[PDB]
Amino acid sequence: KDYSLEIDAVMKAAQINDTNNFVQALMRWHFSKETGSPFWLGMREQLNFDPIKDVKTINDLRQFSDISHCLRQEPVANLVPQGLPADSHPQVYESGGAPKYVVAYDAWIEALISWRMSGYQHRPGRPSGNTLAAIPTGPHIVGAINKERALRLGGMFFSIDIDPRWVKRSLSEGDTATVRKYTHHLVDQVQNTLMNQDIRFLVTTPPVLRELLKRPEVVLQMKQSLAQITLGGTELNLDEIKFIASEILPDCEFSASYGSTSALGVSRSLLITSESQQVIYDSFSPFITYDVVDSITAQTVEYGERGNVIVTHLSPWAFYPRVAERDTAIRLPGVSGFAGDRLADIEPLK
Amino acid sequence: DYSLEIDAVMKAAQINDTNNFVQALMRWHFSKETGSPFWLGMREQLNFDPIKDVKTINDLRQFSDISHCLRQEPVANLVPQGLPADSHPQVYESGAPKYVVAYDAWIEALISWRMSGYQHRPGRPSGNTLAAIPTGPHIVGAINKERALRLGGMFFSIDIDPRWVKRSLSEGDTATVRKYTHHLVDQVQNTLMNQDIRFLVTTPPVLRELLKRPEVVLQMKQSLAQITLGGTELNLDEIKFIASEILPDCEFSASYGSTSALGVSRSLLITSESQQVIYDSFSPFITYDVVDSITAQTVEYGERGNVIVTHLSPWAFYPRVAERDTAIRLPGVSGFAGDRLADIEPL
């Protein structure tokens, strides 16, 4: 059976901002016997409400509980909605790892990157070239997302070896000496590719950039080559980035990327300039939506306040409601007329 | 366009028409219309004519190993113009370091070859693959992803930094090597215990430690149809012991990665009667010669020599690469060009 039309109808509602009809169509999608995943079909009777009857809007998803705990041992094939084309091809990705297993699909990553890059498509005399993504691949969805982006930027995708779990383990054991040497190891790989191939775009993190900038010869190269630097993670220093953007690489654009593997995605910051007072992120609403909640009371904070980040993914490919992330952010109003909060100045839970 | 030209090279290979395969691809690689910028701009400084002075696989000996080019050559230059515009090159690396490009049609071809037995192998298992091997810039990741797709389940990976391991043992820092190895074991254990894994791809040092955890042993006995072991430091006695005493219902084989040749070679199934680990290549696209360390002449069957590998296909051309391995030279063949290898060892 072909549900191509049904999927298309869903993606159309999202594009139009018909967010209420989007949600209702995907409740039907996820909980009907023909099109849903074994996982959500099996979960239905244990919910304390009827997802088809009682969920009409994005706000109504607050009735769901975070089911992240199920994701260590739930067989990954149970995550696959029956409604998806035989051609889909699920790919397995992981977070927490320890660890949670999720499935993602090319059509989803393609849709997400078309949203993410939608502005690059309009901005004047867009740069093109190779991307060096100094980011995890293996079980990490960020790798797959960055590979799709590099495709749109009209060059090839260059990668490095980087084990983020090893870095984490070392830090947690307070082995500062290992973390230190590992960082220099990462820097050396990034240096090699930048010095030996023509790289137009770089995706990295502040500690690796910091070290790269200490070397005049790499600086000279980046100055000539790099159109864009994307910085990822939750340990971004705005004043320092603003310093690099004006004093060191004034011809390079700087942006931040905030990854939510639980929501199968990434959120895109506004460009960081001398005018920037916060780093401000938008999500791919209505597919990925955020709520920002008080650390003590679990109620949505006032705009401008910091609270805990709660992310929800809903799409033809997956459904992960109300996931408590271990990050905090300033809550800001969505622009665009779309549901979901905008986030600023992400930090780790302290 | 060039569709029928490529399809014909593939038919040449399919029916083992070796001479016309080499010839047609010398034309392919050295035409101004279909060639790659790299091999076109390389032609003049050759002491021969690839179109005239090459008839056979053996003739490729006149070529030198261009691997030292591959650091700074723009990867765009390795792309044959003849490839359909809809192709999509991916970059892979080896050694500080060499860049090459590879294509899905190629990896798909290699895997259809590798898995040809998995048709004619009795009532085959299907399920998920855990490939505890490098991804990132490493082609071995992509190849294993394609294999998993054929086996009827999903591809699970781990984080593993092969360059860090190499950097660490090179610094004589064996505390880090031990710690890092168990970090790998820990990740493999988590997936084996939490998800249903049918096929495992790993290395002897990781597998050795996995087997020292009783729960993981029981899980592997219950779930694993196959283990593939990679690298050039196989201990055949050890593997045979594991196959008969510990994992009696799991099939063992070895994989020899030829990154320079954008491929892997598969060993025969390892059994209690195995006396050698014996590898076959995807001939005629990937072919081995085993040569003398001083003279560079092909050794005798049964003798250990330096491994030399050549890739030739519509997607690429990499002649006479000196690999950093030795092997016993063995007769190829159910007709095919190229040597069989046994018992690879590092140089």
Widest CA span in chain B: 63
Q: What are phi and psi of B298, to 5 degrees?
A: -50, 125
Helices (H), ranges, chain B: 3-14, 18-30, 37-40, 104-114, 139-150, 162-170, 174-194, 204-210, 214-223, 236-241
Nearest CA in chain A to B101: A156
Which residue on chain A is closest to B196 by alpha carbon?
A75
Tell me the DSSP string of B249-295: T-EEEEEEEEGGGTEEEEEPPP-TT--S-EEE--TTTEEEEEE-TTT
Torsion of CA B231, B134, A186, A219, to 10 degrees: 110
Which residues of A are less than 8 Å from B184 in CB distance? none
The DSSP secondary structure of B2-18, one letter per residue, reads -HHHHHHHHHHHHTT-H
A interface test, pick of B71, B133, B164 with most A CB neighbours within 10 Å: B164
Separation in Å, CA B224 to CA A72, A335, B125, B191, B238 = 20, 51, 9, 13, 18
Domain that residue A138 falls in:
1-350
**Partners of A201 in the beta sheet?**
A131, A228
Contacts B141 to A, Cβ<8 Å: 137-138
Q: Is B136 on the interface with A (CB under 8 A)?
A: yes
Set of chain A residues whose Cβ sits within 8 Å of the Cβ of B88: 151
In chain B, what residues touch A92 (CB-CB under 8 Å)? 154-157
On whether any CB of chain A is under 8 Å from the CB of B134, the answer is: yes
Total domains present in chain B: 1
Length of chain A: 350
User: What is the SS3 assignment for B155?
Assistant: strand
Q: What is the β-pairing status of strands A228-232 and A253-260?
A: parallel
SS3 content of chain A, % helix, strand, coil (to 5): 40, 25, 40
- Please give the full DSSP string across A292-349, using - where no structure is assigned: EE-TTT-SBPPTT-EEEEEEEEEETTEEEEEEEEEEEEEEE--STT-SS-EEEEEEE-
Give the Cα separation of A234 and A41 in Å (integer). Answer: 35
Residue A310 contacts residue A349 (beta carbons within 8 Å): no
Tell me whether the omega of the peptide bond preceding residue B284 falls within 30 degrees of 0, making it cis: yes
Tokens encoding A104: 């993602």
Q: Taking chain A, what is the end-to-end CA distance rounded to the nearest angstrom?
A: 49
